[PDB]
Design a protein around this ligand. Structure first.
Ligand SMILES: CC[C@H](C)[C@H](N)C(=O)N[C@@H](Cc1ccc(O)cc1)C(=O)O
Ligand SMILES: [Mg+2]
Length: 353
């Protein structure tokens, strides 16, 4: 199998509602959709959803980088994922969205050529994944009503966004808990908003509210502060922005910084690197949660779901980016439907057309 041409295009899909997190707001999912065409005619789908307040990547930068990657990999075999990443890493020192776009399309092609659903090539542990759904920052009563609405849709796990001030954030969590009861799992995400001290204070104040875990409570560069929180509360602490790639994972494991790690294809540059992060974590006794950017869509989410289903150590999933999209840019894959169960069919590769 040989790559004949790499096609890329901008995709801009308005969100049904603006989403607010501690780092900013998003109202449109703008990504780069890649289609790698092979000599034999098979076409693999890839996507790069750059979140500027997460990685600094922009759609224009991502598009330009993908084009450079595209020309450099013509003639290569999609199965030679080792060389494909070698080439991209030599071209750019940092562009996870662009690298993920290429990587995802290559894996899609691998599955199609082998005539197997992607999850079978990535571990084969399962063929489905259960995802939580995220509640953007808003007034306590508002988030609470939304929570009740989501639970009605069948979600048993809600990811609560917080980060404007511990006082207000605690109020948000209490309102949500009171509204939905204790049969619902609640995980919090402060998106780097709290100081180490305030994080501990807030987590302790929510002790009787049965919090499943707390994601990135402190600034990403403050690994000492992150470890401080982890070592000061029994509550599970998850690293997100503090862990982009395998090297970061290796650093957090040596330091014992967190309890769990959030893996994003858009942070590590693809499935190839995501696998490394998970393997490092599993070896260290750290479970992983597959996540996503609000900028990605069907392709990115579908690839993430196949990886999450295939690997035993990826025990949690936050793959809800398609739920806010006004439209789907492609056919097949994970639906725009807001549902907790993401079942992967038997279609080869990503099952996208
Ligand atoms: C809006 C929630 C998204 C789909 C996901 N569950 C999420 O929370 N992702 C990031 C935060 C984020 C990234 C990019 C962006 O444009 C908005 C929000 C996370 O912290 O896990
Ligand atoms: Mg997060």
């Amino acid at each position: 199998m040989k790559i004949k041409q790499v096609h890329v295009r901008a995709s801009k899909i308005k969100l049904k509602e603006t989403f607010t997190i501690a780092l900013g707001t998003i109202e449109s999912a703008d990504s780069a959709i890649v289609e790698i065409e092979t000599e034999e005619g098979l076409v693999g789908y890839g996507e790069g959803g750059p979140g500027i307040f997460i990685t600094g990547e922009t759609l224009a930068g991502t598009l330009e980088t993908i084009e450079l990657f595209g020309q450099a990999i013509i003639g290569l075999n999609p199965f030679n994922i080792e060389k494909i990443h070698e080439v991209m890493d030599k071209i750019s020192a940092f562009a996870p969205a662009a690298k993920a776009a290429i990587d995802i399309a290559c894996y899609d092609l691998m599955g199609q050529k082998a005539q197997l659903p992607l999850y079978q090539l990535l571990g084969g542990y399962d063929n489905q994944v259960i995802t939580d759904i995220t509640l953007g920052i808003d007034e306590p009563n508002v988030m609470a009503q939304k929570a009740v609405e989501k639970v009605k849709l069948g979600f048993d796990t809600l990811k609560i966004k917080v980060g404007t001030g511990i006082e207000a954030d605690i109020a948000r969590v209490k309102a949500i808990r009171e509204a939905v009861g204790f049969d619902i799992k609640l995980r919090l995400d402060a998106n780097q908003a709290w100081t180490p001290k305030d994080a501990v204070k807030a987590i302790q104040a929510l002790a009787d509210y049965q919090i499943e875990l707390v994601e990135q409570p402190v600034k990403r560069r403050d690994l000492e502060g992150l470890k401080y929180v982890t070592s000061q509360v029994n509550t599970t602490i998850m690293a997100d922005e503090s862990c982009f790639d395998a090297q970061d994972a290796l650093e957090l494991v040596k330091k014992g910084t967190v309890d769990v790690i959030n893996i994003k294809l858009m942070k590590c540059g693809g499935i190839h690197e995501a696998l490394k992060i998970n393997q490092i974590c599993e070896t260290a006794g750290i479970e992983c949660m597959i996540g996503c950017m609000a900028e990605e869509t069907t392709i990115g989410i579908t690839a993430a779901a196949h990886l999450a289903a295939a690997q035993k150590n990826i025990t949690r999933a936050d793959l809800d980016a398609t739920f806010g999209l006004e439209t789907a840019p492609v056919t097949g894959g994970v639906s725009l439907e807001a549902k907790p169960l993401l079942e992967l069919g038997e279609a080869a590769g990503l099952g996208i057309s």
